């Protein structure tokens, strides 16, 4: 019992609960004993009957049973390079989209400055441009001394005057 608990809980790089590894081991056992009795690897559908579960769960078990690989092993036939040399950092900054976004917000501010300063402030606080907090209509009213319905009318004015195709063309290309 102690050895089995240790193997289930501690011998895996990715931790798996004992209930799950028990069924994984049962699946491996039944598959490797059915290989001899059939002479052919069984498609999950059939092992699903032995496990009395849907084959989707069997496939999920199989894709969970795989273990992580090492980033130091030489992948080349001869020894000159490591696997980690071929891995791209997803979180790394592409350095083009960031610059594009800088000019993109420049274009945004230039376009919105065409609109009225009241409307510009309304949309700025509406979607959280000056800050990271988009604000509710009542906040816009209390910072403008106006009712929420008039801010709704202001929003209607903003996104209507915004659809005017001169703005539409100069902002559409940037995508």
């Amino acid at each position: 019992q102690a050895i089995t608990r240790a193997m289930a809980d501690q011998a895996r790089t990715i931790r798996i609960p004992v209930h799950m590894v028990e069924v994984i081991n049962k699946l491996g056992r039944i598959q490797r004993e059915l290989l001899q009795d059939l002479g052919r690897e069984p498609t999950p559908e059939e092992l699903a009957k032995e496990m009395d579960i849907t084959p989707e769960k069997v496939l999920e078990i199989q894709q969970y049973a795989r273990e992580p690989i090492s980033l130091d092993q030489t992948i080349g036939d001869e020894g000159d390079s490591q696997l980690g040399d071929f891995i791209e950092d997803s979180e790394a900054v592409v350095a083009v989209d960031a610059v594009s976004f800088t000019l993109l917000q420049d274009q945004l501010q230039s376009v919105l400055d065409t609109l009225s300063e009241r409307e510009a402030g309304v949309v700025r606080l509406r979607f959280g441009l000056t800050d990271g907090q988009p604000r509710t209509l009542d906040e816009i009213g209390q910072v403008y001394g106006v009712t929420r319905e008039r801010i709704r009318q202001i929003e209607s004015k903003t996104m209507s005057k915004l659809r005017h195709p001169s703005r539409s063309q100069v902002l559409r290309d940037y995508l």
């Binding site: 501690q10 790089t13 990715i14 894709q63 795989r66 273990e67 992580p68 690989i69 090492s70 980033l71 130091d72 092993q73 490591q82 696997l83 980690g84 891995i87 997803s90 083009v96 610059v99 594009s100 000019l103 993109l104 274009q107 100069v170 290309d173 940037y174 995508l175």
Partner: protein, 195 residues
Amino acid sequence: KRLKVVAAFQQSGNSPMGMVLDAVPVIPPELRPMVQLDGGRFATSDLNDLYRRVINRNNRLKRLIDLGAPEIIVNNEKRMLQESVDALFDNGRRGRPVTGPGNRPLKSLSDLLKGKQGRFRQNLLGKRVDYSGRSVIVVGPQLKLHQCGLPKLMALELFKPFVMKRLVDLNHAQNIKSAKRMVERQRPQVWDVLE
């Protein structure tokens, strides 16, 4: 021979207490990353295996010592803890190196600083750089000394932001986002603005 080290210890304010170890630091996770290679397969830096081993040994030692155990078991566990520590710091320095799958030694911290594969000689003295390329050379008998040939595609890819700023300056593409596809489609107006 003994003086040339004991005198160095004496002159400095370095206590030899740290020359033995009581706690072990942990390298930041990003320097020992687990990146999910596409397809569900994971990949780790093999330092995490050693860290797991030493953590397991330490936890078991804690359990044995605070549970009450024969001295043989506790001493053996301490021995394995020591072995795990040296394997972490210097794999294969003494005894058989600790291998994993495929019967290959695991990388330790010291293994990252040795030979042409170490941090120094591979990633600090020399580095891979941007704005570069490689091609086959041919004889240039009609050229001058200061001149040299350059393939058109090679120059186009090398001078990317330069031509972007130039073409946008020439109004080739109202916007740089347009200039992306403007250059990557290799439309004819890029060649003169490149030249």
